[PDB]
Each structure stands twice: as structure tokens, then as C-alpha cells.
Amino acid sequence: VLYVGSKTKEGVVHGVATVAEKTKEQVTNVGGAVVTGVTAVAQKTVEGAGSIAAATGFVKKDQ
Amino acid sequence: VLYVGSKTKEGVVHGVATVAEKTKEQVTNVGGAVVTGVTAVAQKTVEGAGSIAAATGFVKKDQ
Amino acid sequence: VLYVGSKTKEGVVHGVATVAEKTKEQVTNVGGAVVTGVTAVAQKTVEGAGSIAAATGFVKKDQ
Amino acid sequence: VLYVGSKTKEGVVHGVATVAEKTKEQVTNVGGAVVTGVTAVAQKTVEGAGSIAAATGFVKKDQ
Amino acid sequence: VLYVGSKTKEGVVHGVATVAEKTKEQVTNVGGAVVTGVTAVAQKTVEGAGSIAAATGFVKKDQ
Amino acid sequence: VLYVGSKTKEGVVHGVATVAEKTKEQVTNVGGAVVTGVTAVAQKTVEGAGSIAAATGFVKKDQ
Amino acid sequence: GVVAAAEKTKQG
Amino acid sequence: GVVAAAEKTKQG
Amino acid sequence: GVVAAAEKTKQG
Amino acid sequence: GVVAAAEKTKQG
Amino acid sequence: GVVAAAEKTKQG
Amino acid sequence: GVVAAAEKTKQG
């Protein structure tokens, strides 16, 4: 019984319940970005960036 | 029974309940960014940035 | 019984329930990006970026 | 467009979210009645009694 | 378009989300009644009683 | 378009999400009744009683 | 007549 | 008459 | 008459 | 250069 | 340069 | 340069 660096928990999601009742959902984009409905998401990243729900219209970089 | 660096918890979500009742949801963007409905999200990042619900219209950088 | 670097948990999702009742979902994009309905997603990344629900309209970079 | 006795609503429950985090629940009865944890319950009754969460130890009625 | 006795709603449950995290649940009864965990229940009754979560230890009725 | 006694709804359950995380559930009864975990239940009854989650220890009725 | 009973002894 | 009973002894 | 009974002894 | 376009006409 | 466009006409 | 545009005409 030493428990060195053990029984850890990092980047965990559990026990999620969700109900979504809609009559008319309508997404309409022109030259852009849309992110809708992200749920029950977990991750762990080492030596690097971590992004889960990102949106970007555009990254225009000319000469 | 030493418990060195053990039984930890970092970046955890648990026990979430959600109800969303809509009659008409309508998203409409033109040359932009929209993020709607992010829920039950967890993460851990080491040596790097961490972003969960980010939006950016555009990153225009010319010559 | 030493438990060195053992019994760990990193990038885990469990116990998720979801109900989505819609009458008319309509997505319509022109020259853009749409991400809808991401759920029950987990990952672990070592020495590199980690992205789960990302959207980008466009990455136009001319000469 | 007359709408006689229409578009009614009687005995309805909707849009309920609940989280219950316990470490040790213990029920122990001897010759009695226990009701625990009633939620999201609806009903309609015509010409008769309506009971939802009732408890009764005993109804002893001898000769 | 008359809508006589139409578009009604009686005894309805919808849009319910629930999370229950326990470490040790223990029920123990001796000669009794236990009701635990009733959820998302609906009914309609005509010319008669309506009971949803009822408990009764005993109904002893001798000669 | 008359809609007489039409488009009705009576005894309906819809859109239910549930998560139950336990480590040790233990039920133990001796000469009794136990009802645990009733969910997403609907019914309609005409000219008669309606019971959904009922418990009764015993109905002893001697001579 | 009916009878119900319980008992929980724990030394230590 | 009916009879119900339970018992849980645990030394230690 | 009916009879029900239970018993759980555990030394240690 | 790239071009995208959409159009939805509905009389009635 | 890029171009995006949409149009939704509905008489009635 | 980039261009985005939308238009929604509805008589009635």
C-alpha cells in the first residue's frame, strides 16, 4: 500500500443526461463557421494545445 | 498507506442533467462564427493552451 | 501492493444518455463549415494538438 | 377558427432536470411503509380518487 | 377550422433528465413495503382510481 | 377541417434521459415487498383502476 | 397477530 | 399469524 | 401461519 | 478565385 | 478572391 | 478580398 502517482483522474466526464425537444432548428451560414450541440466530451493532451468546441469564420492571409 | 500524489482529480465533470425545450431556434451568420450549446465538457492540458468554447469572426492578416 | 503510476484515468467519458426530438432540422451553408451534434467523445494525445469539434469557414492563403 | 374546448392542458409535467449525489443511502423499515424518490409524475383521473406518492404503515382492521 | 374537443393534453410527461450517483444504496425491510426511484410516469384513468407510487405495510383484516 | 375529438394526447411519456451510477446496490427483504427503479412508464385505463408502482407487504385475511 | 423484528449486533 | 425476522451479527 | 427468516453471521 | 451560390424561389 | 452568396425569395 | 452576402425577400 504505497499509492504513488496512482488512482488519478484527469480529463473525465461521467453521468450526463440530456433532453432537447425542438420543433424547427434551422442553421444557415454563408462563408462562416457554425458549431452547435457539443456534449459529453473529454480529453487529455500532453505537450500540445487542446481545443474542444472552436469556430472560426476564416483565416484569410494573403501574400 | 502512503498516498503520495494519489487520489487526485483535475479536469472532471460529473452529474449533469439538462432539458432544453424550444419551438424555433434559428442561427444565421454571414462571414462570422457561432458557437451554441456546449455542455458537459472537461479536459486537461500540459504545456499548452486549453480552449473549450471559442469563437472568432476572422483572423484576416494581409501581407 | 505498490501502485506506482497505476489505476489512472485520463480522457474518459462514460454514463451518457441523450434524447433529441425535432420536427424539422435544416442545415444550409454556402462556402462555409457546419458541425452539429457531437456527443460521447473522448481522446488522449501525446506530443501533438488535440481538437474534437472544430469548424473553419476557409483558410484562403494566396501567393 | 372556433376553438371550443380545445388546446387544453390538464395534468402535465415537462422540463425537469435533477441530480442526486449521495455517498450512502440506507432505508430500513420493519412492519411499515417507505416511499422515497418520486419525480416527474403526472396523471388525470375522472370519477375517482387520484393519489401519487402515498404511504401507509398498515390498515389493521380485525373482526 | 372548428377545433371542438381537439388538440388536448391530459396525463403527459415529457422532457425529463436525471442523474443519480450513489456509492452504496441499501434497502432492507422486514414485513413491510418499500418503493424507491419512481420517475417519468404518466397515466389517465376514466371511472376508476389512479395510483402511481403507493406503499402499504400490510392490510391485515382477520375474521 | 373540423377536428372534433381529434389530435388528443392522454397517457403519454416522451423525451426521457437517465443515468444511474452505483457502486453497490443491495436489496434484502423478508416477508415484504420492494419496488425499485420504475421509469418511462405510461398507460390509459377505461372503467377500471390504474396502478403503476405499487407495493404491499401482505394482505393477510383469515377466516 | 403478525410479528416483525430485526436485530444488528456488531462487536468491534 | 405470520412472522418475519432478520438478524446480522458481525464480530470484528 | 407462515414464517420467514434470515440470518448472516460473519466473524472476522 | 472560387465561387459558391444558392437560390430558392417559390411562388405561392 | 472568393465569393459566397445566398438568396431566398418567396411570394405569397 | 472575400465577399459574403445573404438576402431574404418575402412578399405577403
Swiss-Prot record, chains A, B, C, D, E, F:
Modifications after synthesis and translation: Phosphorylated, predominantly on serine residues. Phosphorylation by CK1 appears to occur on residues distinct from the residue phosphorylated by other kinases. Hallmark lesions of neurodegenerative synucleinopathies contain alpha-synuclein that is modified by nitration of tyrosine residues and possibly by dityrosine cross-linking to generated stable oligomers.
Tissue: Highly expressed in presynaptic terminals in the central nervous system. Expressed principally in brain.
Mutagenesis / variant outcome for changing H14A: Impairs copper-binding
Effect of H14Q: In PARK1; no effect on protein structure; no effect on phosphorylation of the protein; no effect on membrane- and lipid-binding; increases oligomerization; increases fibril formation; increases secretion of the protein; impairs copper-binding
Domain of life: Eukaryota
Result when mutating E21K: Increases oligomerization
Domain notes: The 'non A-beta component of Alzheimer disease amyloid plaque' domain (NAC domain) is involved in fibrils formation. The middle hydrophobic region forms the core of the filaments. The C-terminus may regulate aggregation and determine the diameter of the filaments.
Protein name in the entry: Alpha-synuclein
UniProt source species: Homo sapiens (Human)
Residue window of the full protein shown: 37 to 99 of 140
